[PDB]
Amino acid sequence: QYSIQQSLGNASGVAVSPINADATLSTGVALNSSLWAGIGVFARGKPFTVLAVTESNYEDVLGEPLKPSSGSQFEPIRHVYEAIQQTSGYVVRAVPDDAKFPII
C-alpha cells in the first residue's frame, strides 16, 4: 500500500474523500411514456420559460428543495418529485416582481 489522496488533480491516481457523517444517495431512470405540465415556485430556474425535467435533472434544473420552515414555498417541489417517479414532464417557473439577477 501507499499514500492516498483526498481529491483528484491532473495526475493519474485514485482518491477517496473523507467519510461523511450524513448524506443521501439517489438513483434515477428515464422514461417518456406520458408527459405532464405544471406551474411552481422553486429556488433557481429561468423564469417564464419552458423547462424539461427528468429524474436525473430535477435537482440541477429546478434546485435544492426549499426548507418547510419558510412556509408555502415547498409544496411544488414535493409534487414534482412525486409525479416524476413515472415519467418526465415540463415546468414553467413563476417569480415575484421584486426579483433581480447579478451582473459584473
Partner: protein, 106 residues
C-alpha cells in the same frame, strides 16, 4: 562488513598475512537525550517505506511532534494508530496532555 576502495593506489597494492585485528572506538552515545530532529527524520524514513503495514505504534516516544507526524502517517495511509501518553503522569495531569498531543479534532 562493507568496504571502500581508493582508485589511485590499487594498481600497485599488496596484502600480507595478518591475524586477529580487532575493531576499536565504536561507541553508543548517551541515548537518554535524543533531539526531535532524529525522531522527525526517522518518521520521514518510515513514511516512504515501500512495505505495507496496517497499524502504527508509538513505542514510547512521548514527543508531541513525533506523535503528530505518526498521526499524519495514519491519516495518509488510512490505517489504525495506537499512541500513548506518559504513564508517570497523575490522573489530573493526564487530560491536558491529550490535548497537548495535538491529535484531538476531526
Amino acid at each position: 562488513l562493507r568496504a571502500v576502495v581508493n582508485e589511485e593506489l590499487i594498481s600497485t597494492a599488496k596484502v600480507t598475512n595478518k591475524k586477529s585485528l580487532a575493531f576499536t572506538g565504536g561507541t553508543n552515545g548517551d541515548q537518554s537525550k535524543i533531539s526531535t530532529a532524529a525522531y522527525l527524520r526517522a518518521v520521514k524514513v518510515l513514511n516512504n517505506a515501500p512495505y505495507m503495514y496496517t497499524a502504527v505504534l508509538g513505542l514510547g516516544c512521548y514527543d508531541n511532534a513525533a506523535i503528530t507526524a505518526l498521526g499524519k502517517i495514519c491519516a495518509d495511509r488510512l490505517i489504525d494508530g495506537f499512541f500513548d501518553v506518559k504513564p508517570t503522569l497523575t490522573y489530573a495531569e493526564a487530560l491536558p496532555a491529550v490535548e497537548d498531543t495535538g491529535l484531538l479534532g476531526t
